[PDB]
RNA sequence: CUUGAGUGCAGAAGAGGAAAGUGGAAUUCCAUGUGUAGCGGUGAAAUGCGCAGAGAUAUGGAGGAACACCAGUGGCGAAGGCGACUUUCUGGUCUGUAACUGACGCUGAUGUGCGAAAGCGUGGGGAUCAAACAGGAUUAGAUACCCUGGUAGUCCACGCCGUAAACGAUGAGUGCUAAGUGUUAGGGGGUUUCCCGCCCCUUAGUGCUGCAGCUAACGCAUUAAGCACUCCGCCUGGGGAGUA
């Protein structure tokens, strides 16, 4: 309760964010390949997953951030 | 030219199914020059599934690849299979000068139903 | 939908006195407005489940509060059916 | 009455003049109907993570309108996909 | 919509016909009309060339401006009307200048809606303008193949073409019939599907209702005697003996191609799908 | 009369629903450039595709359907169900609050309506996947598994049927009775310079281990199969038969 990494990463984000205007919360929460870091890795709380998810997705159709970066 | 595209960096693309693996060496573009098939080299079926096929095919196209002549080459990798690791090794034995390997196992986002069976 | 502005307005005329917010008169009026709005949305979109469920809760409770104001009083009852023009 | 942002995206290959009359026109078509062009800016040139018609690279534009929900996107969506200069676009409400 | 008729007798059971909900008046403008005798499918001579026409009901010619020639000038729409000689219902158009001209009706047209004929007339339903300017991924009716004639294309009931893309000269288009053609960049056209969509769910219902139009009967070939048609003759009923089911005039029907491959537009034709 | 119920006021969240709009990968079909003799498949094979240059490789085009990570015993909803994103419309829930009406409540026969997938009509669409079917192989034989193709259909819209292991095989509602432990949205307070961090408490659903007790046993154990009340539905040996 809980065996994941630290509780309380969120101390530097909230209440509402991003939506696209902040790279400085953006790449922290994802990979280098393009996929997302799960909640096991980052140590964030649950709703922030459920926000930053849609944050990056809105960032993708505006092409601020790739669907894929393997090259 | 045109059949003899001489450069010092082209591309290699690789396949490896469970039952067959094909390799090819092309340009940066690419435009295609060589290939080899485990079945082409006499093997059949159950012996296409061998790691050694990676090697003898790797050589077997690498020769004509450096007949045109080439120093370096990139390596794409598809095909979850045995030989995706081995052909790299035996391709270094040819004496060529890979700089990077890109594993692109082509994954969809559920574009179509896969075969139910089994 | 409705929005608090409309709601907080119309109660002032039908509220039996000043501070009140209950006094079921209010409630059948407000619910009346709601069901009409949702009913026209519902004719726009013929097919749904959320709505008709929602209505029939509202209408169902409307009938009840009405059956309550049929016996706590009789004058308010007639007065409100002919004021709002609902429930023949 | 509710708070919309909007982003719109334009190619680089146009001449800078067309960008001017386009933008001013465009804040026009968000303005004309009673709904308020409030705070217009330009995040500007930037490279994309991937190409969208064929362009690696392109322009961005940010503006803002607070309005009723009946005046701005109803016109902009119509005048978005037909226009061969506005590439992509997306509109939201006040959430992050 | 189509209103089924309650069966009361034999000759109504499968019957069906239209509701006429897109109509405002019934009697037309006298002026634009123009008279029309009939021919019953036959020549300047008098001989029958096309079979089974004539027998029908009387009618007239409602004129149309398919050109949409006068450009720029905004218009309005103050009425609909009915048109026998085409499936597509028809609109009347008070131009700005007091002129009056009839136009085929796009689906979803509002009386009082306004519609233009110009280059700078930005896209809506109804507006008339060339192909070069239109965006890709749009449905369009009443294209001209040639500058200034009067359109020949998608002019019937229901939906219409698709623009797949364009060069500078010429311009592509996919039809219904799904088939492709290169079209000029400057031919005048418009946008929006055509009106009446359920003209085809009409179960005509009874024999007369072909005569009312009118058309008239067509007799089969395996019934006649063998002069008049090749299949004919035969004791009792008549399997078609020969292969290659024939017209009365030889010349098969069933699979044979009759496009003449020397025609000039055969380069413009690509990707023949329906024929 | 206010404690049940409902209305408020300030708030929290959500894959709750209907319609429209947008986008990337991927499969496929075709076109073009590159280039030769195999591809693909199996446990082993064969049938098929291919010198008309396949497959492989690169570019760009069309086209339908589904939406990698995220996703978790997580959430929502009355159930069936709902996972790309954005807008429009819109249903209910939980907390705190307590002014506000002052028992308006619970259950619910007959009726009325929503209801997986398959199925049916009418009309559109047709990329995969794939009943029926054909061929191959195995096999004593195989109209079955395996393999290569492959239509309806899957898909959309308006209608219709109206069922399931529709399952937790546990009716709804209220109330009382040991703890521990995680989790989800909230609320009060102490510590902290600031809790955002730590701790203690309290509501609502959510999972596991567990006593009292029950149960024939397995097991349930504040999300009862315990202690009781109300209301409804249902069973009276098995086959015959969910048949006539
Ligand atoms: Mg609890």
């Amino acid at each position: 309760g809980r065996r994941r990494k630290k509780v309380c990463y969120f101390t530097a984000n909230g209440i509402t964010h991003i939506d696209y205007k902040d790279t400085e919360l953006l790449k922290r929460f994802i990979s280098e390949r393009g996929k997302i870091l799960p909640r096991r890795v980052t140590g964030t709380s649950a709703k922030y997953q459920r926000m930053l998810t849609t944050a990056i997705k809105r960032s993708r159709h505006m092409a601020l951030l790739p669907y894929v970066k393997e090259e | 030219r045109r059949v003899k595209k001489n450069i010092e960096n082209g591309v290699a693309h690789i396949r490896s199914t469970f039952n067959n693996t094909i390799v090819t060496i092309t340009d940066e573009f690419g435009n295609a020059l060589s290939w080899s098939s485990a079945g082409a080299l006499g093997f059949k079926g159950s012996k296409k599934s061998t790691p050694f096929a990676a090697q003898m095919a790797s050589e077997t196209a690498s020769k004509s690849a450096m007949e045109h002549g080439l120093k370096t080459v990139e390596v794409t990798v598809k095909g979850p299979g045995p030989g995706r690791e081995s052909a790299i090794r035996a391709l270094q034995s040819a004496g060529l000068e890979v700089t990077a390997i890109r594993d692109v196992t082509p994954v969809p986002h559920n574009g179509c139903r896969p075969p139910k069976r089994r | 939908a409705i929005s608090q502005e409309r709601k907080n307005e119309i109660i002032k005329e039908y509220r039996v006195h000043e501070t009140d917010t209950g006094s079921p008169e209010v409630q059948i009026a407000v619910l009346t407005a709601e069901i009409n709005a949702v009913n026209e949305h519902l004719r726009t979109h013929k097919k749904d489940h959320h709505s008709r469920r929602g209505l029939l809760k509202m209408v169902g409770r409307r009938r009840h509060l009405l059956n309550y104001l049929r016996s706590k009083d009789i004058q308010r009852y007639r007065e409100l059916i002919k004021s709002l023009g609902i429930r023949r | 009455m509710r708070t919309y942002e909007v982003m719109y995206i334009v190619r680089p290959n146009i001449e800078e003049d067309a960008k001017k009359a386009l933008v001013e026109r465009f804040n026009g078509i968000l303005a004309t109907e009673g709904a308020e062009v409030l705070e217009a800016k330009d995040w500007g040139k930037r490279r994309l993570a991937y190409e969208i018609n064929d362009f690696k690279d392109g322009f961005y534009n940010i503006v803002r309108v607070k309005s009723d929900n009946n005046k701005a996107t109803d016109e902009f969506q119509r005048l978005a996909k037909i226009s061969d200069d506005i590439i992509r676009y997306m509109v939201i409400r006040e959430d992050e | 919509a189509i209103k089924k008729y309650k069966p009361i007798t034999n000759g109504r059971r499968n019957m069906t016909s239209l509701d006429f909900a897109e109509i405002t008046k019934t009697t037309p403008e006298k002026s634009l009309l123009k008279p029309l005798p009939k021919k019953a499918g036959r020549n300047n001579q008098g001989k029958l060339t096309v079979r089974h026409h004539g027998g029908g009901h009387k009618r007239q010619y409602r004129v149309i401006d398919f050109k949409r020639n006068k450009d720029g000038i905004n218009a309005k729409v103050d009425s609909i009307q009915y048109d026998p000689n085409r499936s597509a219902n028809i609109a009347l158009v008070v131009y700005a200048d007091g002129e009056k001209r009839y136009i085929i009706a796009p689906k979803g047209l509002e009386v009082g809606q306004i519609v233009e004929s110009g280059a700078e007339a930005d896209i809506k339903v109804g507006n008339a303008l060339p192909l070069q300017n239109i965006p890709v991924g749009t449905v369009v009716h009443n294209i001209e193949l040639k500058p200034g004639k009067g359109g020949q294309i998608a002019r019937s009931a229901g939906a219409s073409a698709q623009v797949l893309g364009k060069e500078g000269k010429y311009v592509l288009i996919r039809l219904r019939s799904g088939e492709v053609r290169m079209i000029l960049s400057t031919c005048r056209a418009t946008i929006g599907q055509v009106g009446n969509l359920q003209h085809e769910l009409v179960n005509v219902g009874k024999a007369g209702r072909s005569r009312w139009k009118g058309i008239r009967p067509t007799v089969r070939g395996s019934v006649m005697n063998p002069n008049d048609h090749p299949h004919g003759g035969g004791e009792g009923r008549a399997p078609i003996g020969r292969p290659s089911p024939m017209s009365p005039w030889g010349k098969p029907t069933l699979g044979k191609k009759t496009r003449r491959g020397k025609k000039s537009s055969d380069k413009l034709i690509v990707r023949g799908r329906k024929k």
Side-chain angles (χ1 to χ4, degrees):
Chain A
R2 59 185 62 185
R3 69 180 183 184
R4 293 176 175 97
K5 197 173 77 177
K6 64 182 288 187
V7 295
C8 299
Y9 181 88
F10 64 89
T11 61
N13 64 3
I15 59 172
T16 189
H17 62 89
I18 293 171
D19 55 350
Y20 61 91
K21 297 182 174 70
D22 291 328
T23 185
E24 295 293 328
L25 189 63
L26 192 63
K27 304 296 189 293
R28 296 179 180 176
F29 186 71
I30 68 168
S31 69
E32 298 179 354
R33 185 176 177 82
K35 295 179 180 294
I36 291 164
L37 296 169
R39 185 178 67 193
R40 293 189 296 277
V41 179
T42 60
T44 185
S45 296
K47 62 186 290 184
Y48 295 108
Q49 183 77 25
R50 290 177 289 178
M51 288 180 178
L52 295 174
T53 300
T54 54
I56 63 167
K57 287 179 180 178
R58 292 180 296 188
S59 297
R60 286 190 179 86
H61 293 176
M62 293 174 189
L64 290 170
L65 186 69
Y67 61 87
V68 166
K69 180 64 182 295
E70 61 180 2
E71 61 186 359
Chain B
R1 63 178 64 90
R2 63 181 179 91
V3 64
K4 190 177 183 181
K5 292 184 176 72
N6 297 320
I7 58 176
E8 60 183 2
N9 192 3
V11 177
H13 298 290
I14 299 165
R15 297 290 294 158
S16 69
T17 68
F18 293 102
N19 59 352
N20 191 347
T21 188
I22 296 171
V23 66
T24 186
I25 297 171
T26 72
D27 306 327
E28 66 198 2
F29 296 162
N31 289 318
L33 301 172
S34 64
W35 62 87
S36 294
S37 298
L41 282 67
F43 297 164
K44 294 175 72 66
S46 296
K47 296 186 184 186
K48 286 187 279 178
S49 299
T50 64
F52 182 75
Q55 308 186 1
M56 65 190 284
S58 297
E59 293 176 354
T60 305
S62 299
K63 292 177 183 184
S64 180
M66 65 183 72
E67 285 183 354
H68 300 289
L70 182 61
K71 297 182 178 69
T72 61
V73 66
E74 184 176 1
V75 173
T76 304
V77 169
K78 295 181 181 180
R84 65 188 177 180
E85 176 173 357
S86 297
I88 299 160
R89 188 173 65 253
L91 183 60
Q92 290 184 355
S93 296
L96 293 171
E97 295 296 332
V98 179
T99 187
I101 294 163
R102 291 188 290 108
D103 192 357
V104 61
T105 308
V107 66
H109 311 276
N110 304 124
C112 297
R113 291 182 62 192
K116 184 177 182 291
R117 294 174 183 166
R118 291 176 184 83
Chain C
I2 54 167
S3 295
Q4 296 184 351
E5 179 180 356
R6 298 179 178 179
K7 186 187 291 184
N8 290 314
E9 185 64 23
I10 62 164
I11 60 175
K12 295 180 180 178
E13 57 177 2
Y14 293 158
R15 62 184 181 178
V16 67
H17 64 268
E18 296 294 329
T19 311
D20 187 78
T21 186
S23 297
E25 305 179 358
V26 174
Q27 298 179 2
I28 56 171
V30 175
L31 294 168
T32 301
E34 289 181 350
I35 62 170
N36 298 122
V38 170
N39 188 359
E40 295 296 332
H41 176 205
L42 185 68
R43 293 180 187 175
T44 302
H45 297 169
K46 66 175 78 169
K47 57 189 289 186
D48 283 327
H49 65 76
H50 67 278
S51 292
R52 293 177 177 175
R53 178 77 177 165
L55 290 177
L56 296 171
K57 292 182 182 295
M58 294 177 184
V59 173
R61 185 171 58 188
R62 182 173 68 81
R63 186 179 295 279
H64 289 96
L65 301 168
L66 186 59
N67 283 332
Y68 180 66
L69 191 57
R70 185 175 179 181
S71 299
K72 185 183 178 184
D73 192 355
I74 60 174
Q75 184 182 357
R76 291 175 181 178
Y77 181 84
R78 291 177 292 176
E79 182 177 1
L80 288 164
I81 60 177
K82 72 185 175 59
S83 301
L84 293 170
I86 190 168
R87 181 62 64 82
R88 64 187 71 191
Chain D
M1 192 71 206
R2 185 61 181 165
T3 301
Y4 293 161
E5 300 183 1
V6 64
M7 186 182 288
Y8 63 105
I9 297 170
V10 298
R11 293 175 287 169
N13 60 5
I14 59 167
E15 63 185 0
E16 187 175 1
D17 296 331
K19 186 179 186 297
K20 184 174 175 69
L22 175 63
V23 172
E24 296 176 353
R25 177 177 186 278
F26 179 72
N27 299 327
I29 63 170
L30 272 68
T32 52
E33 296 294 326
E36 298 172 352
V37 63
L38 181 63
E39 186 172 2
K41 298 184 289 296
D42 174 75
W43 186 265
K45 179 69 179 185
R46 185 175 181 272
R47 66 180 293 276
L48 306 175
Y50 61 96
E51 67 187 359
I52 60 179
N53 299 117
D54 58 354
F55 295 108
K56 297 283 187 68
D57 301 329
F59 297 159
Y60 291 160
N61 286 309
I62 182 174
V63 301
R64 180 175 298 180
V65 59
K66 62 180 181 292
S67 63
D68 288 327
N69 295 314
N70 53 353
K71 284 176 181 175
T73 187
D74 59 350
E75 186 70 25
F76 167 58
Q77 72 187 2
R78 292 182 288 171
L79 301 175
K81 64 185 183 68
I82 62 177
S83 300
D84 60 352
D85 56 357
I86 298 166
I87 300 166
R88 282 183 181 172
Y89 64 98
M90 185 179 287
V91 61
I92 62 172
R93 292 173 69 182
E94 184 178 0
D95 57 354
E96 300 178 357
Chain E
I2 54 176
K3 65 183 182 183
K4 181 71 179 179
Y5 293 123
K6 291 184 186 292
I8 58 171
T9 189
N10 301 114
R12 303 293 299 281
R13 293 185 181 282
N14 66 345
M15 183 180 281
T16 293
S17 64
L18 295 173
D19 192 4
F20 296 107
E22 298 188 353
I23 291 175
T24 60
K25 63 177 177 63
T26 187
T27 185
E29 289 289 328
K30 185 180 178 179
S31 298
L32 294 168
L33 298 171
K34 181 178 184 298
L36 181 62
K38 293 186 290 295
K39 295 181 175 184
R42 56 188 200 186
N43 296 330
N44 56 12
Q45 297 172 0
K47 291 183 182 179
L48 180 66
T49 65
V50 173
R51 297 176 62 244
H52 64 277
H53 294 96
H57 191 279
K58 186 176 171 63
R59 60 170 71 92
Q60 293 187 356
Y61 170 52
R62 296 174 176 78
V63 173
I64 304 95
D65 185 358
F66 300 121
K67 298 183 180 178
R68 301 293 301 274
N69 55 6
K70 63 186 288 188
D71 55 357
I73 303 167
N74 189 356
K76 66 180 182 180
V77 178
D78 63 355
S79 291
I80 306 300
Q81 180 65 24
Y82 178 63
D83 190 355
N85 205 151
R86 289 187 296 272
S87 302
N89 287 325
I90 192 172
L92 178 61
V93 175
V94 171
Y95 289 106
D97 300 337
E99 289 175 352
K100 297 181 179 288
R101 291 184 181 173
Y102 288 103
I103 294 93
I104 52 172
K107 73 180 184 66
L109 188 67
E110 296 180 356
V111 183
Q113 180 169 359
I114 57 174
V115 62
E116 297 171 357
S117 297
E120 295 296 335
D122 294 330
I123 305 297
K124 300 182 175 67
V125 178
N127 290 320
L129 47 85
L131 289 176
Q132 64 186 0
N133 301 120
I134 285 168
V136 184
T138 307
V139 299
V140 295
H141 66 279
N142 200 349
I143 295 103
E144 294 177 351
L145 295 171
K146 293 179 174 183
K149 186 180 286 185
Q152 298 178 1
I153 300 301
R155 199 177 66 175
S156 65
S160 65
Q162 299 175 359
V163 178
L164 293 175
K166 65 181 183 177
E167 295 293 328
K169 176 177 174 69
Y170 298 170
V171 176
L172 285 80
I173 193 169
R174 183 185 294 175
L175 300 168
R176 61 176 168 177
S177 304
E179 193 267 327
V180 178
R181 184 167 184 173
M182 289 187 285
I183 303 302
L184 293 175
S185 297
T186 186
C187 289
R188 183 64 58 78
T190 176
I191 298 98
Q193 298 188 0
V194 182
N196 287 328
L197 186 69
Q198 295 186 359
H199 183 66
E200 190 179 4
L201 295 173
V202 177
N203 296 114
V204 175
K206 73 188 198 175
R209 293 283 302 285
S210 66
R211 300 294 300 268
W212 285 103
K213 298 291 187 291
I215 59 176
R216 70 180 298 277
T218 312
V219 174
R220 300 175 295 168
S222 64
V223 174
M224 302 183 183
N225 296 318
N227 185 13
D228 304 337
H229 193 91
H231 299 75
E235 289 293 330
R237 288 185 191 269
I240 74 175
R242 64 182 68 189
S244 180
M246 293 180 182
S247 300
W249 296 287
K251 299 296 183 186
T253 64
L254 192 60
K256 185 75 174 175
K257 293 286 178 73
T258 57
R259 181 69 178 180
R260 186 177 66 192
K262 294 174 72 179
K263 289 177 178 172
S264 295
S265 299
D266 298 331
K267 67 177 184 181
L268 301 172
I269 293 165
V270 300
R271 195 166 70 190
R273 287 179 182 175
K274 186 176 178 177
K275 58 177 77 176

